[PDB]
Design a protein around this ligand. Structure first.
Ligand code: MTN
Ligand code: CL
Ligand code: CL
Ligand code: CL
Length: 162
């Protein structure tokens, strides 16, 4: 298991524009196109992202290209953020993947706001952090996915993904 395999499980793979759990246009492996309600707007974003006039449909290779970019972007977002970098630096490789997962789903700014959870993670108080993370819109709206991520923080193993 690794961050790519982990997110592939959590996000799935779809080659045509679809709406994610929040109702936002998305494609590939959890690649958010836009929060705009306009499908035309989403198609424009797709064309711009892929570099060609698509039909709202991409290839698997193209999906994986966006995925590579998105994972890299999540890591880069963590390392540039004053709140997230210290936490990331303090973690083992498995829990680092869990943090990348959260940033992939919710964005840098969103996760950076989890001030109390982040403190508990940096303190390595895993059970308490797990309880605190569950007190969130994140957990309530995507409980199974959040449970997997939280379990990863709790145990520092990949047990939730096996
Ligand atoms: S939350 C991760 C976890 C570890 C283990 C003790 C194996 N579990 O049963 C759960 C799923 C609670
Ligand atoms: Cl998804
Ligand atoms: Cl709550
Ligand atoms: Cl879920």
């Amino acid at each position: 298991m690794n961050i790519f395999e982990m997110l592939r499980i959590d996000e799935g793979l779809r080659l045509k524009i679809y709406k994610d759990t929040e109702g936002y246009y998305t494609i590939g492996i959890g690649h958010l196109l836009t929060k705009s309600p306009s499908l035309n707007a989403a198609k424009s974003e797709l064309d711009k992202a892929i570099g060609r006039n698509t039909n709202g449909v991409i290839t698997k290779d193209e999906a994986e290209k966006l995925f590579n970019q998105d994972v890299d972007a999540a890591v880069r977002g963590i390392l540039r953020n004053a709140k997230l970098k210290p936490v990331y630096d303090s973690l083992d490789a498995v829990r680092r993947a869990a943090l990348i997962n959260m940033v992939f789903q919710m964005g840098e700014t969103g996760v950076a706001g989890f001030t109390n959870s982040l403190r508990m993670l940096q303190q390595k108080r895993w059970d308490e952090a797990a309880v605190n993370l569950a007190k969130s819109r994140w957990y309530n709206q995507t409980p199974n996915r959040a449970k997997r991520v939280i379990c990863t923080f709790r145990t520092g193993t990949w047990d939730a993904y096996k």
